[PDB]
Each structure stands twice: as C-alpha cells, then as structure tokens.
Design a protein around this ligand. Structure first.
Ligand SMILES: *[C@@H]1O[C@H](CO)[C@@H](O[C@@H]2O[C@H](CO)[C@@H](O)[C@H](O)[C@H]2NC(C)=O)[C@H](O)[C@H]1NC(C)=O
Lengths: 49, 49
C-alpha cells in the first residue's frame, strides 16, 4: 500500500503525496503484472493433463 | 464508477481490478501518563503566617 507505506495514517500527508504524480499507480501496475504471471507459471508446469 | 475512474476509461472488461484501499479509522483517543506527581506547595508561599 503506497500511501500507508510512505505517509502512514497521517492525512495531511495524503495531499502532499498527490503532488508527485502517478508514482503510486506505477507501483500497483508493476506488481500486478508479477502477481498474474506467478499463477500462470504454475499452470504451465503442472496443468498439462 | 470508481473502477472506471481508476482505469481512465468507460469500458471495463472482465476481471478483478484492484482499486481503492480499506482502513478502519479509530474513534477513542485514549491518552495516558503517570499516576505520579508531587505538587510544590505554593500554598506555603501563598499562605504563610
Ligand atoms: C490557607 O491557610 C489556612 C490556615 O492554615 C487554611 O485554612 C484551613 O483550611 C482547612 C480546609 O479548608 C481547614 O481544615 C482548617 O481548619 C483551616 N485552618 C484554619 C486555621 O482556618 C486554608 O485552607 C489555606 N488555603 C488553602 C487554599 O489551602
């Protein structure tokens, strides 16, 4: 959770973090790509029957 | 509508789309310190005979 890792609970921080653009969107997109591939890795090795 | 605003699109194809977050704010601001505490008797200096 980008907002909870950086800021952490505080709410005055959230308005400041929005000023850096879409860095938190990039982190979620990048990690989702990994998360989807890791299940496909397993299906390709074992689900051959 | 939150999903459509996350994707920046008006068509959402099939699948899970991790969007917001979910934290459960607090309510009580329970504070605490020490039972201790001497006093310094102003009393003496504000009540001498
Ligand atoms: C200032 O000094 C007087 C006298 O020492 C205090 O009066 C005493 O007050 C207590 C409780 O109010 C009584 O039990 C005593 O009998 C009183 N003594 C006399 C001689 O009257 C007065 O309380 C002191 N002021 C403060 C704020 O403590």
């Amino acid at each position: 959770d980008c907002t909870m890792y950086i800021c952490g609970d505080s709410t005055e921080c959230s308005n400041l973090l929005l000023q850096y653009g879409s860095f938190c969107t990039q982190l979620k997109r990048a990690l989702t790509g990994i998360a989807v591939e890791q299940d496909k890795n397993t299906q390709e090795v074992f689900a051959q029957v | 509508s939150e999903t459509k605003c996350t994707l920046k699109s008006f068509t959402v194809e099939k699948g899970i789309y991790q969007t917001s977050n979910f934290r459960v704010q607090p309510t009580e601001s329970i504070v605490r310190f020490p039972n201790i505490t001497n006093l310094c008797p102003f009393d003496e200096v504000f009540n001498a005979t």
